[PDB]
Design a protein around this ligand. Sequence first.
Ligand SMILES: [Cl-]
Ligand SMILES: [Cl-]
Lengths: 247, 246
Amino acid sequence: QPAGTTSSLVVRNLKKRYGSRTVVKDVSLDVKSGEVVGLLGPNGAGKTTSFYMIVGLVPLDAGDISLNGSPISLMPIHKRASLGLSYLPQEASVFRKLTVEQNVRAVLELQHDGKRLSKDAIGARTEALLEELQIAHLRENPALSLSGGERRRVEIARALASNPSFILLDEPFAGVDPIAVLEIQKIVKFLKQRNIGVLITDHNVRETLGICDHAYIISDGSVLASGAPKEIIENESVRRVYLGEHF
Amino acid sequence: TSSLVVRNLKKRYGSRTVVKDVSLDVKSGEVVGLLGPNGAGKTTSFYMIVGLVPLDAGDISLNGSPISLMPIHKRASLGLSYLPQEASVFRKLTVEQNVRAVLELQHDENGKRLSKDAIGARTEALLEELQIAHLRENPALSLSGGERRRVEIARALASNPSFILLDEPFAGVDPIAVLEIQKIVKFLKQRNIGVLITDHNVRETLGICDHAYIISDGSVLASGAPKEIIENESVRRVYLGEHFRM
Ligand SMILES: [Cl-]
Ligand SMILES: [Cl-]
């Protein structure tokens, strides 16, 4: 899909059970390039399983997911990423004791053109990602010396080395200090303006709604409501089930 | 009259000092927040007070008497009750059975076990006080989050605690649930029970606190009523940032 064009992620009628125990009955949603979409709702009522079904870590019992008109419903996580659907798992045990430059370089060493990249083109790509994420100053830092903010910028660099159309952020706000909220908002804004669509699931409603273009409230394994934040907040059923009366 | 007094808590694991020096006070009827950056000492401080983590240095005293070296169960008999999130009720027993089981450990003032009649009366009074009398025969597994919390409270109140330690009550709960929790805390305040809350959710916690301690770099960075905490320039630089609003 050309640099300025709108990729599409289309999710229809997701369904999942374990013991039945039907955790997701029917969830449909859409995400376009440059759009930030929130996947919210009561803890355990299906937003999380829905989210993981779209990452590809939870296999569908029914439904369909298509990325630019091609189905990916059955592809595992790593193959969806090759097609430009990237998951950010927050963790730095993957970084071990390698430097920031080393971690970004290592992901580019797996890319293909359609052959291997030269050591020179890997070097140039590395520099361009560091400078774009404003972490060039962190290039020689061990992964243990990095803040949560710095770590996330590095994972973004890693993800951008695959040229994704969509990035899935798993509870980025869980347990983080209010000073860190700014950092996250800026990273999301940055993805927006690079024409990458963002799907966020979180428990932190105020933080998530504040940066979303569209949100889906998942209750009782289904979509209770969907809309721009302002419409979501004024929805009577969302207020009765999830938000409460003065939010 | 009741006081919880914590002086100069310290905890090191090898080359890491996770807590250098943390002191705080809680009085009956007061709600106290233990906040600060993730990993920077509030959590270990909290668990040192609960008794899940032994002190390396410092002292904790409850109504005059030291408890630093007492295990969790003995701190509770002296009126210091720990409420973790979703982990305190007997899963399989009914609501009435859960409340009854904690009253079966109590004594009268003479140090004698309670009669079947005093347990009966106390049970009914707690059920009606927490508005869960209608749930009395429900298994604890069949209860919603709201109902489950009220039952944990009943279980805690059946100890006659002077202090309740609430571990991360707001973690992952939806805004409907936040209001319920604030009301339960208000209700403990009014029963002249002191509450020490540690949480990551600053707006929710500060909104119900009489006093808060911000823990950074293993120490107390600042302490005060909420209004003074949020205007404190070090708290703003380190933890809250520029845009944080209450
Ligand atoms: Cl879920
Ligand atoms: Cl800690």
